[PDB]
Design a protein around this ligand. Structure first.
Ligand SMILES: N[C@@H](CC(=O)O)C(=O)O
Ligand SMILES: N[C@@H](CC(=O)O)C(=O)O
Lengths: 580, 515
């Protein structure tokens, strides 16, 4: 009998009972001639004491993280050993028998330290004994259940899709698997279940979900395999997918006791880029971008003679020392931008900083009113191509929030971002780490199977820059936590998307024929969404890195300090691989 | 508005209401001047009728498996068009407006035929529209929920384990993944979560489960990837694992309305081989083996209330005990089939316990399996399986007589699960490896992360995994696991749906970091 009672539930009312606990030696301390340990199991901790005889002699072997079974009599602790901070704090187990189920060597790190990432991954099994990490895993399980419960209630069917398949393009490279029985051929682990979930709508399943494993080989806080909550529905429009996504987000945030107000805000891509410099905007604070391109259209200041000029306002920043302002330049350089021009606004409205003297009287006179500044403030400006200037202002805005302590650590600010344009230049995609769908000068903003908005259906291939899509992202605290779209369900439209990314009919049929052929047999309208489940769990847990909510994660570049994967193989094993 | 009401739920009480249905044209027939369809969605079927005007002219385009939205008024059907065989059979929708959401070409097969396996897999998305295959998938989802509900109620934590890892030996070959950033190196897709679930017990998680994906490269009704309900517990003995396994089997069979009596029968390996010729015995019938060794190596008998049969697969069988018993084990089954002795509604379960610890590597290599290493013995269950207490000192030096704390769960002559209490000490585990020819250094290289973990207070632990595809296939009443997998492979890993596996560009191969 290794266990008769859980350690966390003993109380004074249990005095006189004989119990057997099994768990681990959290701490050991010696006072008098006697040995005290805290014995920990999943339900909590009880003090155990070894007072006489052979059990006292045996207790001398005990050290941190020994695994033990102890039988003994529950007792009320003496006056003044009571520990009021723990639920079993009034009692202890006076030990009768002790059995060492497993010894522990001295630890690479004690459980009350946090060690380097490499050590914590290497000894992840010890890390997970610490309260924080272990509760992260317990939470994650609860988060999976909260999602499944809402989905089941709304008649979604859970369906497992293949992982040894053909490639789906989600913007990364594929992980490959050589096929022993077909020398020279490979399976691809899937970047997402996208193609399968679409087929499942053609199959009449109507409402699908999966908590599915996805594989993307990318630049590396990024893991080579990761988890999505993946959903698809038939006969829907975006609102329907949003509405059910909201129910799932509500149930999920309920797991940490936050009541999510519904429905969630929405904002268009254009407007998110305009005001926040980001398609993943952090709305826990203001500090919005203000466009000044038109404002400065007649400037004689070389720097503001540009496609784009924009500003953000730092509350109270005119007081900043010259040192700190030089620091703002470093800030921008460390992100590959020329810098941040600025205007200091005095208490009497007078303008200083280096910019001031380059303005005209008209420009000086209307400026504060134009950017919404106040006496005492600091106006930063970025000028250049619209896309780069906005990202810089988008970053700047965040740094301003940090320095002025404007982000409430308990706040949850969500928004949908909708009305995404349909395409990205392929130049911008290759150099941002992503993989373009093909060799064409355009590629998908979301993915190739994303539908144009009805009004963009005729022109998306002849005027790609203007084309709008029926895609939607869900953002929480400046993180993308999900995205989806209404799909294309016709071959002609889908092939037109592929052709302009340089995939002609024949290649489209070779690489995606099974989907295109399926469109010929009564395909319904459909669409869906996937949530980044690691990211969502990480947020609920209050941690910054998804490594903290994955049981056995990789580090950087796919290094696995726990098992030392990936590893080479024998020449024999390689011959039998059928590779080569 | 594509849909306002489900098609299966209309009834006479809905007469006069305007509804919009969206689904598919199951059937079309024309009589009088009128076009009748059956409109199907997941909830069932309602008849829709097109009687006048523009909607009639448009209904002329409709053919099987067109996908449509139809708005119309619900009506009671005329006397003598009532269809008593379907729940909406008393009513129809008189259509007002019609929209074709997606045309269908002529089908490779109609939904009321069953076609060849290759065609059904090639057009699996059409196959799944047939009642049988689609309900199989709906059931499987329910089966997953029934298992999760019991496990959550008993404080198990669902935990996801890696798939890009190092190899675990479950008796097959590994599927490999080349690592672009480490030229010449590979990940292995996991044969099961075994190593991780043991680490999780060392991590103090105490009760783990996962519905996990497993990858084994074998001979081919066998899929290269498949699903396990995987469980592990700390501070347990076999009975504790069996007890919780039984609760999970009860909740699962309740999904088809069978009340599973508990506890389940148990029988030792020795006795299962003796009486049934099989460690996966079918107990829906008798026809037991009778040993004919003491009617002056092995002679046995079975009684039928045949030569071709024996030849094609390898009264009385005589020879080495293991082969003779398998033949009699097979014979017994053929007897049951020919005399119609198997009640198709019966569920006969049993645990098989007290498994011996090893088998010969000769018997394993020639049965399709892969031995753990170079040694003349290999595991009966897996290398991490504990010897029974009495076998702890001699399993090394008298392997034939060593007994293990493993257990299998069998239903109707299928293994549907298996587990064991594990080893949690390095010396014992290494002694197991050594006799399979894996000495200390190789054991540390290939399994060091587990062995090292045994130095930091490892608890007793054990568990089990169920073959979830096989269990779902049984609940559904089908013989092949292909019928309860959404997009399965056929034979030899052929995938008629997507044509995987496929070759790759020279460019793609260079970037692979392979070569
Ligand atoms: N397949 C998408 C999700 C979606 O479009 O629903 C992804 O991987 O992000
Ligand atoms: N890992 C085993 C199951 C177990 O031993 O629990 C299997 O793959 O069958």
């Amino acid at each position: 009998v290794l266990r008769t009672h859980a350690a966390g539930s003993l109380r004074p009312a249990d005095a006189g009972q004989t119990v057997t606990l099994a768990g681990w030696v959290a701490r050991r301390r010696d006072h008098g001639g006697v040995i005290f340990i805290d014995l920990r199991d999943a339900s909590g901790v009880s003090q155990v004491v070894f007072r006489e005889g052979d059990v006292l002699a045996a207790a001398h072997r005990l050290r941190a993280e020994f695994c033990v079974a102890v039988t003994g009599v529950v007792e009320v602790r003496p006056e003044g050993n009571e520990n009021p901070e723990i639920p079993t704090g009034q009692i202890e187990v006076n030990a009768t028998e002790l059995t060492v189920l497993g010894e522990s060597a001295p630890l690479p790190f004690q459980l009350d330290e946090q060690a380097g990432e490499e050590a914590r991954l290497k000894y992840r099994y010890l890390d997970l004994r610490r309260e924080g990490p272990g509760n992260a895993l317990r939470l994650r399980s609860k988060v999976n259940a909260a999602a499944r419960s809402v989905l089941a209630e709304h008649d979604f069917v859970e369906i497992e899709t293949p992982t040894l398949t053909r490639s789906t393009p989600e913007g990364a490279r594929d992980f490959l698997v050589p096929a022993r029985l077909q020398p020279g051929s490979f399976y691809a682990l899937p970047q997402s279940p996208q193609l399968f979930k679409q087929l499942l709508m053609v199959a009449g399943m109507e409402r699908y979900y999966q908590i599915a494993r996805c594989y993307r080989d990318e630049d590396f806080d990024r893991q080579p395999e990761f988890t999505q909550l993946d959903m698809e529905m038939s006969f829907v429009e975006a609102d329907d997918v949003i509405a059910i996504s909201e129910q799932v987000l509500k149930a999920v945030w309920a797991t940490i006791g936050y009541d999510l107000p519904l429905p969630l805000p929405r904002i268009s891509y254009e407007e998110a880029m305009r005001r926040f410099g980001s398609d993943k905007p952090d709305l826990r604070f203001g500090i919005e971008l203000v466009e000044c391109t038109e404002y400065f259209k007649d400037t004689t200041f070389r720097v503001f003679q540009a496609p784009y000029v924009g500003a953000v306002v730092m509350p109270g920043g005119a007081s900043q020392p010259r040192r700190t302002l030089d620091g703002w330049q470093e800030f921008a350089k460390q992100r590959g931008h020329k810098g941040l021009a600025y205007v200091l606004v005095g208490e009497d409205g007078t303008l200083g900083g280096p910019v001031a003297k380059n303005l005209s009287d008209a420009e000086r006179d209307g400026l504060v009113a134009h950017v919404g500044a106040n006496p005492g403030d600091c106006i930063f400006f970025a000028a250049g191509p619209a896309k780069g200037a906005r990202a810089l202002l988008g970053a700047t805005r965040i740094e301003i929030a940090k320095r002025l302590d404007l982000i409430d650590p308990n706040a949850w600010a969500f928004t949908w971002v909708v009305d995404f344009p349909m395409f990205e230049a392929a130049d911008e995609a290759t150099a941002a780490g992503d993989v373009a769908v093909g060799s064409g000068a355009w590629t998908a903003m979301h993915h190739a199977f994303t539908a144009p908005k009805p009004d963009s259906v005729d022109t998306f291939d002849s005027d790609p820059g203007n084309a709008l899509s029926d895609a939607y992202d869900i953002v929480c605290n400046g993180n993308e936590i999900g995205g989806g779209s209404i799909r294309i369900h016709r071959r002609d439209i889908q092939e037109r998307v592929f052709a302009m990314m340089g995939i002609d009919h024949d290649e489209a049929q070779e690489k995606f024929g099974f989907l295109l052929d399926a469109f010929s047999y009564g395909a319904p309208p459909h669409g869906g969404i996937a949530f980044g489940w690691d990211r969502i769990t990480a947020l609920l847990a209050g941690v910054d890195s998804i490594r903290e909510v994955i049981a056995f994660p990789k580090s950087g570049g796919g290094v696995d300090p726990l098992t030392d994967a990936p590893a080479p193989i024998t020449p024999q094993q390689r011959k039998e691989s059928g590779i080569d």
